[PDB]
Amino acid sequence: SQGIQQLLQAEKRAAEKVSEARKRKNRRLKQAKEEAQAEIEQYRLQREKEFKAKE
Amino acid sequence: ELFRSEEMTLAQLFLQSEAAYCCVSELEELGKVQFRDLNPDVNVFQRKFVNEVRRCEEMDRKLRFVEKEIRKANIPIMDTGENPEVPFPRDMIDLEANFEKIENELKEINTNQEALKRNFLELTELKFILRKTQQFRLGFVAGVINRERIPTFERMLWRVCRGNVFLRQAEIENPLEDPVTGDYVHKSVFIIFFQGDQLKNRVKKICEGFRASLYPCPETPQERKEMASGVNTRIDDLQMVLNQTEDHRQRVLQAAAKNIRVWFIKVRKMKAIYHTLNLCNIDVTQKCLIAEVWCPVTDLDSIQFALRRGTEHSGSTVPSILNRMQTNQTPPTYNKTNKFTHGFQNIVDAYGIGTYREINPAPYTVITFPFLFAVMFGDFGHGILMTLFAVWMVLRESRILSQKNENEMFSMVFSGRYIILLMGLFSIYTGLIYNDCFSKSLNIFGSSWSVRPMFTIGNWTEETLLGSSVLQLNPAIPGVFGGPYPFGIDPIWNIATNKLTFLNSFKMKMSVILGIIHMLFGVSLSLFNHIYFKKPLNIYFGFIPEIIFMSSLFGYLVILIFYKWTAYDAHSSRNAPSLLIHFINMFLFSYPESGNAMLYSGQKGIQCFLIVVAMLCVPWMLLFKPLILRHQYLRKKFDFGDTMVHQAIHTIEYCLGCISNTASYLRLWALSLAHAQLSEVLWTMVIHIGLHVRSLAGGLGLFFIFAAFATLTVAILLIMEGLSAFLHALRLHWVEFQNKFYTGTGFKFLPFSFEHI
Amino acid sequence: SDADVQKQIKHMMAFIEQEANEKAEEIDAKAEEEFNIEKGRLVQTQRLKIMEYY
Numbered sequence A: 001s002q003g004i005q006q007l008l009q010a011e012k013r014a015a016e017k018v019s020e021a022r023k024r025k026n027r028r029l030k031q032a033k034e035e036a037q038a039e040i041e042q043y044r045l046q047r048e049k050e051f052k053a054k055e
Numbered sequence B: 001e002l003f004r005s006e007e008m009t010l011a012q013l014f015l016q017s018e019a020a021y022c023c024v025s026e027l028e029e030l031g032k033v034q035f036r037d038l039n040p041d042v043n044v045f046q047r048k049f050v051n052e053v054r055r056c057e058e059m060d061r062k063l064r065f066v067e068k069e070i071r072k073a074n075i076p077i078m079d080t081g082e083n084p085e086v087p088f089p090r091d092m093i094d095l096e097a098n099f100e101k102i103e104n105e106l107k108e109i110n111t112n113q114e115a116l117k118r119n120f121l122e123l124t125e126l127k128f129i130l131r132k133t134q135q136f137r138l139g140f141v142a143g144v145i146n147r148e149r150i151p152t153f154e155r156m157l158w159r160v161c162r163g164n165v166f167l168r169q170a171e172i173e174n175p176l177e178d179p180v181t182g183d184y185v186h187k188s189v190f191i192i193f194f195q196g197d198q199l200k201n202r203v204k205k206i207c208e209g210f211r212a213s214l215y216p217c218p219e220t221p222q223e224r225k226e227m228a229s230g231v232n233t234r235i236d237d238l239q240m241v242l243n244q245t246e247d248h249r250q251r252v253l254q255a256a257a258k259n260i261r262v263w264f265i266k267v268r269k270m271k272a273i274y275h276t277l278n279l280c281n282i283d284v285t286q287k288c289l290i291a292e293v294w295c296p297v298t299d300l301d302s303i304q305f306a307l308r309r310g311t312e313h314s315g316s317t318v319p320s321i322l323n324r325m326q327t328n329q330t331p332p333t334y335n336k337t338n339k340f341t342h343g344f345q346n347i348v349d350a351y352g353i354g355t356y357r358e359i360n361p362a363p364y365t366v367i368t369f370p371f372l373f374a375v376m377f378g379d380f381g382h383g384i385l386m387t388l389f390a391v392w393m394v395l396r397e398s399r400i401l402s403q404k405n406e407n408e409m410f411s412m413v414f415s416g417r418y419i420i421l422l423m424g425l426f427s428i429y430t431g432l433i434y435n436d437c438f439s440k441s442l443n444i445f446g447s448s449w450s451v452r453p454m455f456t457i458g459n460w461t462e463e464t465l466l467g468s469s470v471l472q473l474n475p476a477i478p479g480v481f482g483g484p485y486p487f488g489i490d491p492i493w494n495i496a497t498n499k500l501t502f503l504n505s506f507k508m509k510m511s512v513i514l515g516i517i518h519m520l521f522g523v524s525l526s527l528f529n530h531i532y533f534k535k536p537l538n539i540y541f542g543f544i545p546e547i548i549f550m551s552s553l554f555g556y557l558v559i560l561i562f563y564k565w566t567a568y569d570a571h572s573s574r575n576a577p578s579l580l581i582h583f584i585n586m587f588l589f590s591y592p593e594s595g596n597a598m599l600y601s602g603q604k605g606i607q608c609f610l611i612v613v614a615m616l617c618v619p620w621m622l623l624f625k626p627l628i629l630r631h632q633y634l635r636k637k638f639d640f641g642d643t644m645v646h647q648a649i650h651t652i653e654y655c656l657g658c659i660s661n662t663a664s665y666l667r668l669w670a671l672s673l674a675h676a677q678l679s680e681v682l683w684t685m686v687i688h689i690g691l692h693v694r695s696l697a698g699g700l701g702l703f704f705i706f707a708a709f710a711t712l713t714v715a716i717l718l719i720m721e722g723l724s725a726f727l728h729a730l731r732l733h734w735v736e737f738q739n740k741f742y743t744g745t746g747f748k749f750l751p752f753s754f755e756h757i
Numbered sequence C: 001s002d003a004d005v006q007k008q009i010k011h012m013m014a015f016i017e018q019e020a021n022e023k024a025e026e027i028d029a030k031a032e033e034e035f036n037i038e039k040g041r042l043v044q045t046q047r048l049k050i051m052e053y054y
Helices: A002-029 A039-054 B017-030 B048-071 B092-133 B145-161 B195-209 B223-276 B300-310 B341-349 B362-376 B381-393 B410-417 B418-432 B452-456 B499-534 B535-567 B580-585 B603-635 B640-665 B666-685 B695-734 C003-054
Strands: B008-015 B034-036 B139-144 B166-171 B187-195 B213-215 B289-296 B323-326
Touching: A002 B008, A002 C003, A039 B499, A039 C003, B008 B017, B008 C003, B017 B223, B017 B289, B017 B300, B048 B092, B048 B223, B048 C003, B092 B139, B092 B187, B092 B213, B092 B223, B139 B145, B139 B195, B145 B166, B145 B187, B145 B195, B187 B195, B195 B213, B195 B289, B213 B640, B289 B300, B300 B323, B341 B362, B341 B418, B362 B418, B362 B695, B381 B695, B410 B418, B499 B535, B499 B640, B499 B666, B535 B580, B535 B603, B535 B640, B580 B603, B603 B640, B666 B695
Parallel strands: none
Antiparallel strands: B008 B289, B008 B323, B034 B289, B139 B187, B139 B213, B166 B187
């Protein structure tokens, strides 16, 4: 029956599209340990400036 | 319309998997629908909903357990109202916890009732033991035993404690109730005295041997009195806790008796839905569902509305559409029923289930079965008895519907009550026209027969002299005879010695005529069946040569019978021809040119023409039907061999089988003669003996003789020959009527429904 | 007959792929929370070493 045959293709595409979204978002999730460093340097610079003020 | 199998269609359903549970629920609530299986891999561990169905099977086993425990307590189950299904989410977890709660609470409250009731009895026995024992190293025991065991008990004590036991006993002020069985037992207290533990072991072993119970008691009257005040306090505390335990038991059992109705409905609806969902097909990439169903043609829209409601009762938006299928397998078979027609349909379905749109035998059966039966059963006396029985069951209907069903015989005859009434009523009708009540006439009919003065006319007048000395025959000649007669059988034919010759001529010819008529109706129903299937070949090469074969034999046989009954009379009786001999001579093309005369002018030519035309019909049924069918399936580019074998066997039955079936209807006559003569002898050597020349002896004799007659008449005729005529009337009906037209091959309509809960 | 089936089949085909896109947006919402958590863990780890040093 051509009805369920067309639906089976959209169900396959739906199961692919959610899994592609998981893969793209997992690649962004792995970047979190790199994007963290610029904030860590600002905390270092803040404590350096405060330390110089205490000196 | 109910003369044929009701119209249906197969449909294909597109189902979203969240709507699907609610969709199936609404379809089973509607209950007009039967699913087609699309999952050949279905099995206990392979069915898509393994855990959900397995969990529903366990909840049904748990339901049966809690219901049985409430029924063991004699508490009535609620047995009223109706409820919705459980939602698709895992709310079954709380229902399983409710079954575990009721199971544990039932096991707990059984344990607590037994423990408190057992302790209450044990303390009551201890009260009676102390009351008697208060009247009295050293050692002693005291206890309780059934009073009838005492003589063997004291003898055995004196055997084991050789020649030396001081003891006493007394009966308790009332018998005591058994904690398990509720029996009341005439127990007696006893006390036994000795020295040392060696004798304690012997007396205790014998107490256990007689199933007696020992209890601890103090060494002095003063301490026994203090212990008795303790026991009185304990019995009142035990009674208080026993009353509280009964109040808690009543709460638990009555709460369960209410809940069991709701839980039965919920578990049955869930099991049904999940079982029906396993019939769906699921491919490797699939997330939605596809299914198919058969439904009545009137309700293919009703299933689509049930699907729409199933979606609307769910979070999913998909309306769940369907289409009407074209390349269909043969749909299931159904017809409507009511109080009267239900029994008549059951006796059809038990013999076979029609093909789709096939003629239904049941509407014709409503009369035809009662008619064949009443021809077999046509005694006016038994007609009254059968009517009174069936009327009693109909009048008491609303009472009998509340009574026991475990008597399957009583339930079966009550389920037959309306069909049994109609066959009984027709047995009055046939009994009146046959003019037989208990092998006696009704005097309401006039006389065709001749009074003695009619013989004085010189013609046969020796009757008037010979009748004073010897047996004599009425010749029925004109001027002597009363002429044509408008009533049933003349009353004279019950008292006459030759009656059975005349009455068998009637029942024999009647059985032939009715059988011929029913076969002619059966082929006429075959035409309607072939018209309803719209098949030209089945009519033209089937029905036409079939009815011409039948009519060319049967019409002549009936014409001859009716002609003799019009053209011949008493003065023509000498050298009158034989009907059966003319029929066989016709069939054989063999009038003997001698002896019995021809019945009418040109008859030899007519006989030859009729049998030749019948014999010319047979080849069309045998071969021309198969050959035209072969050319049709060869042009459309089916086996000719199998078709020829099937159609050959069918044609033999449609021809030579129908000749034999004319004789098969002689079962009518046969059963009627047996019934009549069984009744005759039961009169002749019972009722006749009760008549006597004195009032007291006659009245007493008649009472007992007729009571014996009634008992035998019921057992032999109303029960046993009743069942015989019932089955034979149906035999003729199922075979030598229905086999002409009812194909009786098909699936029973068994819709998936909550109405089976 | 078949045209209304084809319309509802097209709607069911769109519906299941729309459900996959809704699940991809749930994956996005989960992934940005987990990203902010893992970024925050490393920030606070070196920020603590920085605070202790100074």
